[PDB]
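Here we describe the complex-level prediction in full. Unlike the single-chain runs in Section 2.1, the four entities below were treated as one system.
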Amino acid sequence: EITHAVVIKKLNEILQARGKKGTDRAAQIELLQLLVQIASENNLGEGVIVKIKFNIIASLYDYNPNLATYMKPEMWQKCLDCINELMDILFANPNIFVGENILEESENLQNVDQPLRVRGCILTLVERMDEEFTKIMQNTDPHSQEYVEHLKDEAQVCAIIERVQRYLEEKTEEICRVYLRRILHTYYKFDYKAHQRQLTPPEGSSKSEQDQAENEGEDSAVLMERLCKYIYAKDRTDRIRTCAILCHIYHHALHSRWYQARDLMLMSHLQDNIQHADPPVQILYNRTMVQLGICAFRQGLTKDAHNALLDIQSSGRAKELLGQGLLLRSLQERNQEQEKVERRRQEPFHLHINLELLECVYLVSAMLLEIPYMAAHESDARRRMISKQFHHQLRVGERQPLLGPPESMREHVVAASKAMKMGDWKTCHSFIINEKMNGKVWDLFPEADKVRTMLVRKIQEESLRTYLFTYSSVYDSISMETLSDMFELDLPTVHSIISKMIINEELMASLDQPTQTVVMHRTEPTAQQNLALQLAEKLGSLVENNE
Amino acid sequence: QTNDLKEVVNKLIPDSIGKDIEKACQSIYPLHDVFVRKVKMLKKPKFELGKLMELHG
Amino acid sequence: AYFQRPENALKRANEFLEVGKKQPALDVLYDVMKSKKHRTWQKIHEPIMLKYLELCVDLRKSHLAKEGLYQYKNICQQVNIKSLEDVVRAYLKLAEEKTEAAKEESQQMVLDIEDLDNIQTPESVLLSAVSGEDTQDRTDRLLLTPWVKFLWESYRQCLDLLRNNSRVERLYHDIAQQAFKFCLQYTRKAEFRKLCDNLRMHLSQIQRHHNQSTAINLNNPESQS
RNA sequence: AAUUCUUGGACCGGCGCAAGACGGACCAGAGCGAAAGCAUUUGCCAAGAAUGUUUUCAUUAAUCAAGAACGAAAGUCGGAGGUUCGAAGACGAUCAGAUACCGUCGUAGUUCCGACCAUAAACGAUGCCGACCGGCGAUGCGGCGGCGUUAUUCCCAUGACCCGCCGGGCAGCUUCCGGGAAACCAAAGUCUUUGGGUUCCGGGGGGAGUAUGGUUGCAAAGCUGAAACUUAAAGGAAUUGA
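The structure predicted for the assembly as a whole is:
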């Protein structure tokens, strides 16, 4: 009403009881609201309102006494409106609104320190908002309909973090902060989001300037992480090039190349380097390293994936990806963990990864040690399915399988006695909804990888298993039986000659092979030599002992 | 304030109001003997017949 | 001292339900069951306990149905437990009949708008479609699961503490059968506890016998049947 | 018992109406205030002790002739008001007599606003400021620490209890601190082993808080205040009798 000679001098007599005990905390936003709905004149209701509003939203966040408790949906939506209006009236006002000489008034308040650390009191509003939104998500029952009602605001948030990003009057150097923010929302947006902005192939379908507005987002990690990494090799802090790169690695997984993101994960060398950061960095590292192994599997790289997903499943405390696990040892620190805990829809499913260890080993166990398991033991690997295989045949009444481990083992044992369709069509019944097939963001491509990897490791069964009294052999019908590409099952039987060196003879101009495999009961007096090896090994060790 | 006299007397027959105040004032200083000591009728409406004849079943 | 003439207990409990305040309506009846008035089952104790367990069901409190039955059976000894048997049967019938109505409405009216709903996936579920499954399960959990975790508890309730060994009780093996028939209508993990409770209370059975405990022997009913 | 009221319906009972006083029980060897004094609710206005402080100024302080603010009750002048009670007074009883106690009336007054008066057993019958010298249990306010109980059920965290510690306050109990004529007092102690600072004030009992002069007030009266003369005790605490 009076030329900010009463407005800036009440703003201070209402923004003085902020955080004092007997303030009530609630009838304060009202007095900060009755300075834009009672202020209704140019730079007196319209122009200096940047400052009145900065103190309206800051006090609105402070309706919560605690910082370990979540805001309520009413004041939450009020914030998401209150934040938007500032951004819309700030865009079409090309001026710095806590100082920096423009005309004369009502900006240019350089009397107080410097308009940067309160000019960048805009992102610390929307950054506090992003850290607030996680509390809403952590503090809901995840299986409830309220959770999806709450995730409907995930879209509302990502529109405001975009609007504050478009605000490039930075001084990448120090907008890097809201680049980390932006990528921390998009780095785990799945294939349906990533692919279906170009995978409607570019014709008169989706390459027009007005439709190609959301295809910016997949090749955005590359646009933004490049800056946030290669500027922070110069700049000070650790978190805004290490969170950024692990987001780039994790995003270049789950849709794109294993080879692309292994170079990035090796380039960082965090394998042995990430030791002395904070657990809220060491958690999303674990999430990334699990997504490494899943992508390698989904590609069909089924032992380098097994050689990676060992120590996570080997340890029962694999809950570094989810909510908190077991009981006692320090309540005092267990309280600190349930605000470290990652949000629900970000969590990768755990009977999905149990069914990635105990299927990568299924293809590097039910094949590998069948060549020295003719009573020819000296290749023993005692960390496998056997952790399960010992115990779920160590009982008597065994019928149709229900869990992941049985519903894996029950066709493993009939993949052993080749039975090429008995081994397959127990891995594609109700697994699809049990989060084996559907749960990966590919419907019939993970099974197309899998069942091909079965159809090849089910001619490599005749190799070590059914070769006993085979003196003549069939080859046209063998690929026609297993309904595979004949060459695709010729090349692994080819591999078995140069690698497994089977007691059999290859003549593949005729497409037959006589075997002459007669070690039938020559192998049993050398089953008596398996031990006369241990006799002979240690008489090459008794004098080592003695002398 | 929010409901009619028939429902207000229905509340006064227990002491539902006296219970509610005894529950609210637990945090400030726990009370025990909380009763609605008295009720006085100051001003009454325009005496209709259908009102009382439905208040009398 | 709340009540002279314990018939008045019900008059106040009913009078609190004229307001629609079920917590103080329960408070009265619980305060009445646990005092001097332990005179072996007055004909008033049937509607006292029956209203008490009706309110206990509607408010969804397992621990108060436990307490009420535990006070009732103490004052209602073998002199006459015909009323205890009818009380526990009525309590279980109220619980399972409300859950039937809870399934019906939350599996039709809300699942009929769920047939009309945005099944043509929005992005809000395309994020949530890497862990969970159908929206019928995501909604019925919210409105039906609170009642089945009450039913299960109410079956463990009446079996666990009220009927150990207890010579006087066929109704034990009645509840057990009717709760086994409950399992293959709804959730399944409340059956692993069912089998293991039946076993653990059998291990409670066959050792000592220092009560009016089951003489597990030639007696055809209590042992075989 | 009588004076008073009442078949122009008193007293008793019901429904209302107005008036002017007064805030029961909760209410305490509890609180606040310089003393007088202060109690239904809610709002507004300025003040204040104690506590907390690794804030600030740097001796600014203690007590005080002159001078000044407040000062129960009663009382005087002016305006409003007058329910109760009630100096004066009108009677009714009792009594040897009653001009009193007791009882029915009852003007001033009691209540409010504005001017006065400045005194009380205005008392802790005890000036103020500072230091030192036993113990115990509670209590009111502030702080601090700790098993556990109960509400916010989600209990972070506040409130209600519990156990202790620190500082200011109202008091209490106890003892060969010590004092005192004793009664008694942790101050009325640290006093012939007499001295921390300062204001007021007492000198046997009367005459007498009188006379007189001065001063203040409309009046009532307040503050200051002798002498002649009379007198051997008056008095304080405690003891043993009656």
